[PDB]
Structures are given as structure tokens and as C-alpha cells.
Symmetry: C2
Subunit: 112 residues, 2 copies
């Protein structure tokens, strides 16, 4: 059961790719919820953060470092929010691990 992210990864679905390496891919959200809204995904198709395991420690740290690097590259110096959704109550849309990065507006509280 590959998710739609398999098409972003294999480039069969065009996307605005901000960053790519052997471990991960970064691309703009199809439906931005802020002036800047992008996703950091692992190439390893970890379905959800609840299903990450000890072996994924280095990859998970790499995803946060790529998120904060890309946030700087996208001019989010006045701040931003990183979001990971798990499961139904999380509103997880796609069952491939992704970090949302939202900036360029005041994010409110609570976070949904």
C-alpha cells in the first residue's frame, strides 16, 4: 500500500521540491495552511510516528535537522511550527511519516 508520497518520491507526481538527499525529501504542501507550508518525509516509508522504532533514531533526528535547515532557507526567522500527526485523532491524512512546517503567519493556540 504505497501512499501518494510514493509518486512525489518517484517524481511521477510533480511537486515543488525544496531539498533531497538519500534519507529524505522536502516539498511544498498541496494545500498550504500558511504562507509557507512544506513537508519533510523520510524515503523509508515509516507509516506513522507511533510505528517508528529504535533503529530510526538517526533518521528521525535527520528529519528535524532538515526541517529547521529548510525553515531558514524559506525565511522563517520570525518563527514557525513543526507538526507530526499520528492516526485518526491526530488528523493524519497520509500514512507515510511527514513533518509539516508552517510559517509566515501567526500560528495560534491551541494547535488544532
Amino acid at each position: 500500500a504505497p501512499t501518494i508520497f510514493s509518486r512525489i518520491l518517484d517524481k511521477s507526481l510533480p511537486a515543488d521540491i525544496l531539498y533531497e538527499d538519500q534519507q529524505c525529501l522536502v516539498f511544498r504542501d498541496v494545500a498550504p495552511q500558511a504562507p509557507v507550508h512544506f513537508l519533510v518525509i523520510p524515503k523509508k516509508p515509516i507509516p506513522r510516528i507511533s510505528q517508528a522504532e529504535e533503529e530510526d533514531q538517526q533518521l528521525l533526528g535527520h528529519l528535524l535537522l532538515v526541517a529547521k535547515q529548510t525553515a531558514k532557507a524559506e525565511g522563517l526567522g520570525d518563527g514557525y511550527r513543526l507538526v507530526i500527526n499520528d492516526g485518526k485523532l491526530g488528523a493524519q491524512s497520509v500514512y507515510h511519516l511527514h513533518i509539516h512546517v508552517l510559517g509566515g503567519r501567526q500560528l495560534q493556540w491551541p494547535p488544532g
Copy 2:
């Protein structure tokens, strides 16, 4: 009346404690013991620690009974609504989270 503080988890690398102004029936906070003021100021040397914090977040979520789903949130700076200038991972569960996430 702010709720009583409570540590859910502690190891050599981190502390997990309840949010005393919770925004969900389950709402806790994952912090490194290492002084990292904000995620934008993490550096390459923090890679293992940052993955450790996400694994602790997921593990604590399971211990708190968040099997139906939950949300992890990291705020950076004023536009992120970052309230304390120390790295915090917010974990929220026990209700439907909405979209957008603020």
C-alpha cells in the same frame, strides 16, 4: 488553578512532564536536558538527541493510552507561539485534533 506538575518520564537525555494548562485531555511536554533554546538553534551534533526526543514522545504517547492518534508540535519563535525558550515537544491526544494546527 493550574494543574499539579508531574514528570511522566526521565532519562539521562530528557524530561517529560504534563502541560499544567492542557489543551487536550492528554497534553504533555518532551524537553532535552541539554540547553537547546529553540529548534532553529539545534545543530548537527544534536541529531541523536533529536531522534531520541521523538522516540520518547511516541513511547510516552503509547503509555498515556493515545492509540487512537495524537499530535506532536514544536513551536519556534514569536510566529510559532513558542512560550518558553527551551526546546519543547508538545504531545496532545484524547480528543479530535483539528486542521489547520493553529
